[PDB]
Design a binder for this molecule. Structure first.
Ligand SMILES: Cc1ccccc1O
Ligand SMILES: Cc1ccccc1O
Ligand SMILES: [Zn+2]
Ligand SMILES: [Zn+2]
Lengths: 202, 203
């Protein structure tokens, strides 16, 4: 049944197996093993160190995020800014990456305001980090953080930074994140400048 | 229908509300092909052709291996061909590539294998062109490693494919040939990748 909330997203997704294809509207898509991100993670971790590995993965989340936001942005006009926005959290779910449970979410584009506080349930990345590195001294959902930052930044037309305050990878129960405009914490290829600041986590 | 794809489809669970997708006990991610292209380029720019290539093949190898573990559990009332086909059928469900069989000759016990396949709508050739323009060599690294991996597992031995024509070199479609390592003019997954690259430059 429904499950009616995300139905305009699913509608957009076509599975043509006899032809080797999958579509999210115009965009072509793949169904993948999380192994290939696990591998990328092990590899890069040792070729470059952690810092550069971390950045890379925020970058890749970021571009995914931006992309989903592009593809969904005309999509919900008879709904308010927030029911719209949630497009992002929802795709993250559809794509089998993480479950988004809204603790708080308020946003106004014109007022240039944003506050998101979300629980992140069964993060695919947290699993993957643990089964290659074990318990981390810090939160490890880098790709999911990037996507968050990427997706939101587009929808809000301004830079929006998130901090994972709890992570299953540190032995918290579930991961958790808070997101505000850049301006409200402490102190293009603008896309790559943003990646850098998500790296200054606390 | 998908009369012969069905058994595979019945191992794949879409749990949208929970952020989960499953194949058997394995998690899966829906991803833009254009993000793969970006990944490919960025890796290129950090480590070079050899390593990028090396990575994508090692990756494909692993996924191919895991799938073959998963599909080996099923199908055992059928014969080694109809069973083997689970692999190319997976590549299709995964939205990766479309497989068309020219010739297939296999016997686990005989240690004989020979595959000649066409690859019809290869995502990898697409994204390669986007990033790199026309190529001097074939481009389907991940698809190839997966071919090698799936096959190697399913037979008892390193089967090695060679991409013979690639859409990215301007060919009409991509095509492959698989033979056992020995028939080429061991088990280490990172050695398999070396053997594939070493070969493609001795031809
Ligand atoms: C927190 C978040 C924000 C936007 C899109 C996805 C997501 O997980
Ligand atoms: C998935 C697969 C397996 C073996 C050979 C080709 C191919 O596409
Ligand atoms: Zn986490
Ligand atoms: Zn190709």
């Amino acid at each position: 049944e429904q499950n009616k909330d995300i139905q305009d997203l699913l509608d957009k997704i076509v599975f043509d197996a006899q032809h080797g294809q999958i579509w999210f509207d115009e965009n072509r898509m793949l169904l993948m093993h999380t192994s290939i991100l696990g591998f990328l993670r092990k590899d890069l971790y040792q070729m470059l160190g952690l810092e550069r590995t971390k950045r890379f993965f925020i970058r890749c989340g970021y571009q995914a995020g931006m992309r989903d936001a592009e593809v969904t942005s005309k999509l919900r006009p008879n709904l308010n800014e927030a029911e719209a926005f949630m497009a992002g959290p929802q795709m993250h779910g559809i794509r089998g990456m993480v479950q988004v449970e809204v603790n708080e979410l308020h946003l106004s584009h014109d007022l240039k305001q944003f506050y998101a506080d979300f629980n992140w349930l069964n993060s695919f990345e947290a699993e993957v980090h643990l089964s290659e590195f074990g318990a981390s001294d810090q939160p490890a959902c880098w790709m999911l953080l990037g996507y968050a930052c990427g997706y939101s930044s587009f929808v809000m037309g301004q830079t929006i930074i998130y901090q994972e305050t709890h992570c299953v990878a540190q032995g918290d129960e579930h991961c958790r994140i808070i997101g505000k405009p850049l301006s409200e914490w402490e102190n293009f290829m603008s896309p790559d400048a943003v990646s850098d600041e998500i790296i200054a986590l606390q």
